[PDB]
Amino acid sequence: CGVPAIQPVLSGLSRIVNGEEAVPGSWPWQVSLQDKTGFHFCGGSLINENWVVTAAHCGVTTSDVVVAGEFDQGSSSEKIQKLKIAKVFKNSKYNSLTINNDITLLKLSTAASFSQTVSAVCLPSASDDFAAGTTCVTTGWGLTRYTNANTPDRLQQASLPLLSNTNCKKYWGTKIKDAMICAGASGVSSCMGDSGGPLVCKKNGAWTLVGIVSWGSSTCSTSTPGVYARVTALVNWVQQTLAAN
Amino acid sequence: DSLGREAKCYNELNGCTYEYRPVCGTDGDTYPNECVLCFENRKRQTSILIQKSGPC
């Protein structure tokens, strides 16, 4: 876990008005949720060669497809993995009103083939503590400007720091829960089509699954923090379901 | 001769979820998702509906 064969290159463009385009194959655990139609509606992260972790508000069906090893979705010329889904294991504690406990585990029919471009993300430990002001990473195919209404063909990366529950409440107040973590308000935002993807904080060499894109500004406001499912507070459930399945 | 379909928000949230699920409004415009059309009706005080799902 959490070491790309292919090394990412995070430049100062990754930090301003709506990040940058990634080096192809640098976030191997990055997957795209798609229709039978080949329509990207969400992202996910690979934690094994069999399971994918996503956001529960995404509504993935067994009918949907997990596409591994993609850069340019606008291609038709990449070596990608279209894995089928066998079972969707959505948290029972997810609150649809509140968007709390927004984690869903997907069990694959076809195991994915770790490659140079496919690998898994390290999962944290509940005990884990990721300090506010920590600069992290979010990745996806979400809109660049809210005003684009056409998702990007190539993967993007934004550099953004975590926020204290206390300082997010300033912007969201009572909405912000315990199974929620915030990041942003720094010139970068997660937007429509980023949902289920990762918020990865580097821990001791490893890129570690710290958040899942959840929800945020209606309009992908770069001065407002974006909210993500808090992995450490939901990680034990990950272990448990993975174990019992 | 027919239908309609109104777009819904999460009220317990005054933000939107980040999924890409375009919806075609009765106005002839594409919304990234449904909560977006709702948040735009609310702020613009409009009453646009969902023609068809997916892009216009």
From Swiss-Prot, chain A:
Places the protein is found: Secreted, Extracellular space
Main localization, broad class: secreted
Enzyme Commission numbers on file: 3.4.21.1
Chemical reaction(s) catalysed: Preferential cleavage: Tyr-|-Xaa, Trp-|-Xaa, Phe-|-Xaa, Leu-|-Xaa
GO (cellular component) term, any one: extracellular region
Sequence ranges assigned to domain Peptidase S1 in this UniProt record: 16-243
Alphabetical GO biological process terms: digestion; proteolysis
Record: active site: H57, D102, S195
Disulphide bond pairs: C1-C122, C42-C58, C136-C201, C168-C182, C191-C220
KW Nuclease (keyword) present: no
Gene3D superfamilies reported in the protein's UniProt record: Trypsin-like serine proteases (2.40.10.10)
Domain of life: Eukaryota
Prodomain positions: 14-15, 147-148
Keyword tags: Digestion, Disulfide bond, Hydrolase, Protease, Secreted, Serine protease, Zymogen
PROSITE patterns linked to this entry: TRYPSIN_DOM, TRYPSIN_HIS, TRYPSIN_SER
PANTHER family, sorted: CHYMOTRYPSIN-LIKE PROTEASE CTRL-1, CHYMOTRYPSIN-RELATED
Protein name in the entry: Chymotrypsinogen A
From Swiss-Prot, chain B:
One Gene Ontology cellular component: extracellular exosome
Protein name: Serine protease inhibitor Kazal-type 1
Source species of the chain: Homo sapiens
GO molecular function: endopeptidase inhibitor activity; serine-type endopeptidase inhibitor activity
Keyword annotations: Disease variant, Disulfide bond, Protease inhibitor, Secreted, Serine protease inhibitor, Signal
Main location: secreted
Intrachain S-S bonds: C9-C38, C16-C35, C24-C56
Coiled coil: none
Included range, full protein: 24 to 79 of 79
